[model samples]
Target chain A: SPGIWQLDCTHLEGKVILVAVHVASGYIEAEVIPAETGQETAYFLLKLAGRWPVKTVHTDNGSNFTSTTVKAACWWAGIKQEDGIPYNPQSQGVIESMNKELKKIIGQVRDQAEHLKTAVQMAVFIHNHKRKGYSAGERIVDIIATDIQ
Target chain B: SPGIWQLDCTHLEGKVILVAVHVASGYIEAEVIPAETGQETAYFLLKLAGRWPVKTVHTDNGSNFTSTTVKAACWWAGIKQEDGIPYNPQSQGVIESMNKELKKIIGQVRDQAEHLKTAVQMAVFIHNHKRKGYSAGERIVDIIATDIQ
Candidate 1:
């Protein structure tokens, strides 16, 4: 149950941002793909290979996901793939929730940011760190200080 | 199985937009609350009373909703209130889906439009009208033209 539960791609003014999230940790991962294609999905899966200890990837039943290339990539990575009921996005709730917050932050910064990708990355970083008691930066510093003590 | 399934509130640059969707018809209703409060949730429920034959309203277990004031309001309206699984937003899939699309449209028009509320309204208008087979506007016009016969 403590595994990657949801993955999705959201459209922001034509740019596509691929997102995945851990169900239990609230940890998020994202990539701004140039286009909405199966090849990009394949690339994203490959990227997840090293980062997340992914057991299974739950996704939407879109052509980009149902394609042979993406299927082969997941198979090669030893990742189980499951498609949520079409039109019922709740089945992949983790990433959908992340997309909601990301879109809101992106909307707020879309005008001021010089680079959209950087803005998105900053938002994601804040999201991951802005959890329970300590900021992610503060939490990391706390970990280091505790080890030294 | 066929009960009214979803409700949620989204923040569009500080403004609170309350939305609800009917799972059966894909019909949507919304209100831009000037402020966030249980009172606004009550008002939105009152508005929905006239339009949709609401049996049950499924929503996030947020303070505005879980409060006695909002619960009593629903009780007065003779509408059953069902709280979605805490932290599991996909449980309110219909409105979450609508909110996702609404934020995207709002983002695209946020800078260009003179009035943010107007932009958001236009986006909702377009969303409701843009449906299966034909646009809502087109269907209305077709019905009117046929009535002349």
Candidate 2:
């Protein structure tokens, strides 16, 4: 449970983005991205965990994550790298669930015949705030330890 | 009610076959195909419409049907034409229904691991032999007037 964070992308296209979720606390941080690359990940690493003590990062074996820039960034930060087997997102279930949630929100707006950017932004906001999750008739926020970030 | 055939291609690479169906009688004849064009339709027409003139041919607007060669052949054969909307095959209720019935009967032969070609053949066979029509749900062959060519 050291340096534990989940990395993935959702609703890939012009509006694609990179998302990193804290595994235990379920705290999420998202970066709006035009595209994903090792260069982008290196820059994101600076912003996302600037000077914060990091340990391990779990990601899928996408070329962007394994490229020289991202790998060098992790080496500099003294973080361990772990990659999931192909099509085995269930091994990183929490992040995969986050991907599904993001896609569901983004897809609804994207499917409608409307402007893409504003609808996507609105979906992100609604997904993070307005939507409620019910489990065994109990609201998700009641049990979730952290607030939406 | 003029064209008396429903021609389609099978899975064999470089093989495009023609199937002639008696619209009134619902009897079927198939021929090995090289090119899917007027040549195949003309060949079938010559065999089936022997002296029993074809009046109209109804088919979905596939390139095979809408091509100039096909149109020329049908015109020379003195057959009228009814071209259904291209993507939606539902307008050709008879064939579309037969397709669905085919899928249902033959779908069981293949699961996730089977090759697509086998499924195609099975579906074709089931479609020809097992399909049932409305009006007390008689099989297609039984409902078809056998007396007509």
Candidate 3:
């Protein structure tokens, strides 16, 4: 359910940033910063990953993420690190879908302004909780709930 | 208006493989062959150029795809080879979405035996023909003609 990385705005002058999803549940999390700096990213991760015991952490080896602090945290958490093949987005499959879904939701809201108020919080909610599964081509929400173990 | 790429996957014994997609329309074309031998890659490159005037071709810099033969074909065809940032999938955004859509459909069919008979193809058809709007935070495909360029 998690897709890819995207930026809308940040908290710090250059870095109000967020990690939109876990690359599996399509769950979104965020932090404030200008750029996706290493320390800031680590800080963001520290706060964002609260209570979530992830066994593996995949990143693009971005300077912000592959930094000492972040790597150390990943090591501490015993999370395996996954870096996609260079120039290959397919490697980071789940989050990429997440990013597209986000774009579609935002794009729809912008074009259909009269229908609803488009806020980032609401957009994230719509993407995660409200959206139904249309995988391959069939509606499978019930199936997903029952089968995913 | 073009958002989809139709792919033909015949074989991949020993060749340079390249996957490309049109960003807006989701048109996918995958080429996998036997060996990245200069002659064969060139043949495939020419074949690819003849089929579509691609604006951009994206992939990892594998020897098969980034070889001289393939690069030349892209250059001569006047297509830009937009390599995604190392370890980022946003470069191949459209094709990846196509795969996820495919996975969702397959996951559903596997879950419900009755939907298996014609689910894969049907899911693709329904996806292509569905409307763009999302009701209750869910995407419903109700428009078939709008994906055109």
lDDT score at residue B87, model 2, on the 0-100 scale = 55
Q: Which candidate leads the pack in lDDT? A: 1
- TM-score for candidate 1, residues paired by index: 0.42
What ranking emerges by TM-score with the best candidate at the front? 1, 2, 3
Q: Report backbone clashes per prediction.
A: 0, 5, 47
Compose the digit string of candidate 1's lDDT tens values, residues A1-149.
54444677787866888776655555566667677687668656654542333568876456855888778757755678877553554555645666898888777756644556645654565566565764433333233223323
Q: Write candidate 2's Cα lDDT for A19-113 as tens digits.
A: 66545435344556777778667555533342122456776456855688778656644567667454554556766776787667767767542
Q: What is the lDDT of residue B40 in candidate 2?
A: 57
Worst 10 residues of 2 chain B by lDDT: B135-144
Worst 10 residues of 1 chain B by lDDT: B140-149
Screening candidate 1 with a backbone cut-off below 3 angstroms (N, C-alpha, C), the clashing residue pairs are none
Q: Per-candidate interface C-alpha RMSD?
A: 24.7, 34.0, 20.7
RMSD (Cα, Å) of model 2: 26.5
What lDDT score is found at residue A21 in candidate 1?
60
Q: Where is model 2 more than 4 Å wrong at Cα?
A: A51-53, A86-89, A107-149, B1-149
Residues B31-116 of candidate 1: C-alpha lDDT, one tens digit per residue = 66777687667656644542233568876447855777678657755678887663654555645667898889778756644656
lDDT of 3 by residue, A1-149 (tens): 22222222233223243553444344454433446655555444433332233445556446644588667545543455555343555545655555566556556555433222222333444443453543211122222222322
